[PDB]
Design a protein around this ligand. Structure first.
Ligand code: HEM
Ligand code: HEM
Ligand SMILES: CN[C@@H](C)Cc1cc(C#N)cc(OCc2ccc3c(C)cc(N)nc3c2)c1
Ligand SMILES: CN[C@@H](C)Cc1cc(C#N)cc(OCc2ccc3c(C)cc(N)nc3c2)c1
Ligand SMILES: C[C@H](O)[C@H](O)[C@H]1CNc2nc(N)[nH]c(=O)c2N1
Ligand SMILES: C[C@H](O)[C@H](O)[C@H]1CNc2nc(N)[nH]c(=O)c2N1
Ligand SMILES: [Cl-]
Ligand SMILES: [Cl-]
Ligand SMILES: [Gd]
Ligand SMILES: [Gd]
Ligand SMILES: [Zn+2]
Ligand SMILES: [Zn+2]
Lengths: 404, 402
């Protein structure tokens, strides 16, 4: 039972939940690989064992463990698999599954919200157009005219044999990236790949560097097709700065809804290749990684030049100065537009609150320190000086190979 | 079957074969990771010692030679007669450097090959100890142009006690417990301050009182020593434009000289072997001055900057902090005392990784410690994957002798 200490306060806790961890991670006693983005890499007897674990933590989670309906539900599931191979979840369990997996996402700093997640059951989906509507309701529900709401939409579970549902975009809302006779990129270089996969599917390229990409959806076996997004349901925020009047004229913007559509939801031993979720941004994601990463928009030195900072030398800390103000502009803009946003100080402190809750509940909490700690002002936030244990619980969100 | 490590900023892929030599085991299992934890006979001395001799004769391109096979036989025979063995002049220099080179949490290792090794293995008392220490500080400080150095005191041996330096650093500021239940000076050194005073030291009342040394010879009680005022170089902290900053009465010292870690070389352990380099501005600016439990000036500074401290989204914490770092970097250059900012430091650390990959095919590195405590993703070490492991020679922790 690992001794985890908070060095800011001096409190000490033992992580008993880590003991009930399961599927092994990339670390061994001779070398720690906990800074790896993808943990190493990417007659079904398995399903039943995974199926009981989930059903049982379901019923213990509502006290109804032992005898009566609990006794009863386990048999119907045993019967269901024995005859069919796969099995179906009761809708309540699906909600349970969705929520617990958000609770078990080691890299996510917004888990204090895990008890508040809207679950759109789309297991009866049968088409490529049928996904697209199920998506549009999500975006509209989740955007809620800027008062963002946590939501996930589960599409039908991939079957024994035969194809699966799969969204092809990393996110439902992404900007394009274009090449040229310089080979450089106008737009979002992270999404050039999918933009490449779009144009040769019939899409027409664009003008500026903030062209919202078109969705590329795909139902079993019949190859994917394009779906153009309605601009009313893609709410963006133009970026301005509370006192740097020249900042607006950089023509910067970002979308409201962070909604990730290429990860795999696993519940009770079933795999959902298509099951996109959404919440709301933390400022640093937009201002620090999306706008300032060298292999992203890379706006840093432009902002510095407008601030008349000394870029000739690193010790002037112009990089740090411009970053802080770009972040200030994100938080300001989003609140002007009345779109839900959280600063990294408020987000982290609530994640402390979340640990303390989880301690009384499940005696531990899988947390990935290299990701909970914010990408700027790290030590200034409470999570920095807090020791964490990272491990794998189920249900969980898993990465998966991309289908191109 | 060696770790594949990627740099995501550029796109580089290398494999860490050096990690397979990892001559120890840490806290991480396939079941869970504990990378964030701060604290993670004759035959056995034999296998470690034999490994270091093999190391040393490779660095001078003479592996498997006459002098090598001689040196092996010499060693294992001497452990049979005495229980231990003594390092030569040149081996001690090599082991010392190899310990810096291997230290996973150090971003300044680009410089490991330039370390001034002092041999004080002949030390006899607490007074000679002080004298070697005063001399170290003098060479290293160098009137502001800093120099990397280590002083090596007598190795741990059976039958005699240990040399220890009781202070965590050669230079540290006093921490006075107040009537209010507050602390004057540095709160991190409340404990060592206790010991000094109860061992006959006359306490000051300042926020930056430089602590005496508690120095202990074998089987002796520790003996108190005052560093000559003019030996310790200190830097007044001011800000290039915020002029009220200087009225804060803040200062920091030039030489960071960690004095409480253990130096292990080929199975021998030197419990007293202080070493020093120069400061990176964030250690002083972010960590020492802004950590809530240390000097805690962050809020008190933002209030002066007229920032909105009533709410987080104004990022008043982040703004205060960057100007505190700026003040550190400015004050040290104004006083011509060597210092390195976290962009330059991480940048040179990336050269080191390129160097070590060609030299030993890898590099022990602790991601959580290599990434500066402000502005991580701005630095090139943020987006670089790393492998943490333990190679020997090495600097290790050890308990407080009290
Ligand atoms: C509501 C406020 C939320 C905030 C502020 C938030 C914030 C974050 C942040 C900062 C990351 C780091 C990943 C990156 O840097 O790209 C992350 C990752 C993650 N989040 Fe959250 N999130 C929220 C909601 C949610 C929801 C609703 C879910 C699921 C239903 C979720 C599940 C996850 C998962 C699985 C990851 C890991 C992604 C990966 O491994 O690459 N989060 N989140
Ligand atoms: C010359 C300039 C140097 C710089 C800029 C530098 C930088 C750093 C920094 C910033 C840390 C982490 C600080 C912290 O704990 O907050 C560190 C750790 C460390 N460095 Fe250095 N260093 C330098 C010289 C040296 C030398 C000369 C040695 C050995 C002779 C050394 C060995 C170590 C070791 C063993 C640690 C880890 C200590 C621990 O884990 O508690 N460094 N370095
Ligand atoms: C930029 N980091 C990438 C390099 C790694 C990454 C991979 C995947 C996948 N698959 C998905 C990723 O998305 C991260 C994520 C997922 C969900 C989020 C939600 C729901 C809210 C939020 N504010 N940020 C999120 C961030 C990231
Ligand atoms: C504030 N850090 C603590 C939380 C952890 C720590 C513990 C010890 C010990 N013993 C020693 C430590 O030393 C860090 C260190 C060691 C050597 C350094 C040198 C030689 C130079 C430099 N600029 N910084 C150093 C920083 C750290
Ligand atoms: C190399 C490094 O581990 C990796 O790029 C991680 C570090 N921490 C991160 N943290 C968050 N939130 N998002 C990221 O993309 C990363 N990148
Ligand atoms: C608990 C936390 O991981 C620990 O306090 C570490 C994090 N990384 C660090 N990195 C450096 N360079 N110095 C430190 O003191 C710390 N503190
Ligand atoms: Cl994003
Ligand atoms: Cl220090
Ligand atoms: Gd101007
Ligand atoms: Gd001024
Ligand atoms: Zn690990
Ligand atoms: Zn700190």
């Amino acid at each position: 039972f690992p001794r985890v200490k908070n060095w800011e306060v001096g409190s000490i806790t033992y992580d008993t939940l880590s003991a009930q961890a399961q599927q092994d991670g990339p670390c061994t006693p001779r070398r720690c690989l906990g800074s790896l983005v993808f943990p190493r890499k990417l007659a079904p007897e398995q399903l039943l064992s995974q199926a009981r674990d989930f059903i049982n933590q379901y019923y213990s989670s509502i006290k109804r463990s032992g005898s009566q309906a609990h006794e009863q539900r386990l048999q119907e599931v045993e019967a269901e698999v024995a005859a069919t191979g796969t099995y179906q979840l009761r809708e309540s369990e699906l909600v349970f599954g969705a929520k617990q997996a958000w609770r078990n996402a080691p890299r996510c700093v917004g888990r204090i919200q895990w008890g508040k997640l809207q679950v759109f059951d789309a297991r009866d989906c049968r088409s490529a157009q049928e996904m697209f509507t199920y998506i549009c309701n999500h975006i509209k529900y989740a955007t809620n005219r800027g008062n963002l709401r946590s939501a996930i939409t589960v599409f039908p579970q991939r079957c024994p044999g035969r194809g699966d549902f799969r969204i092809w975009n990393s996110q439902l809302v992404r900007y394009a990236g274009y090449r040229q006779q310089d080979g450089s990129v106008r737009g979002d270089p992270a999404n050039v790949e999918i933009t490449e996969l779009c144009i040769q599917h019939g899409w027409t390229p664009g003008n500026g560097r903030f062209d919202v990409l078109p969705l590329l959806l795909q139902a079993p076996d019949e190859p994917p097709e394009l779906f153009l997004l309605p601009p009313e349901l893609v709410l963006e925020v133009p970026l301005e700065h509370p006192t740097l009047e020249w900042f607006a004229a950089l023509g910067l913007r970002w979308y409201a809804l962070p909604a990730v559509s290429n990860m795999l939801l696993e519940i009770g031993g079933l795999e959902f290749p298509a099951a996109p979720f959404s919440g709301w941004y933390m400022s640093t994601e937009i201002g620090t990684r999306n706008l300032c990463d060298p292999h992203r928009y890379n706006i840093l030195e432009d902002v510095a030049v407008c601030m008349d900072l000394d870029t000739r030398t690193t010790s002037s800390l112009w990089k740090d100065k411009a970053a802080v103000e770009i972040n200030v502009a994100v938080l300001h803009s989003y609140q002007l537009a009345k779109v839900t946003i959280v600063d990294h100080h408020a987000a982290t402190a609530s994640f402390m609150k979340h640990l303390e809750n989880e301690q009384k509940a499940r005696g531990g909490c899988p947390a990935d320190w290299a990701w909970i700690v914010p990408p700027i002002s790290g030590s200034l936030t409470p999570v920095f000086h807090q020791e964490m244990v990272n491990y794998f619980l189920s249900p969980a969100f898993r990465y998966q190979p991309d289908p191109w």
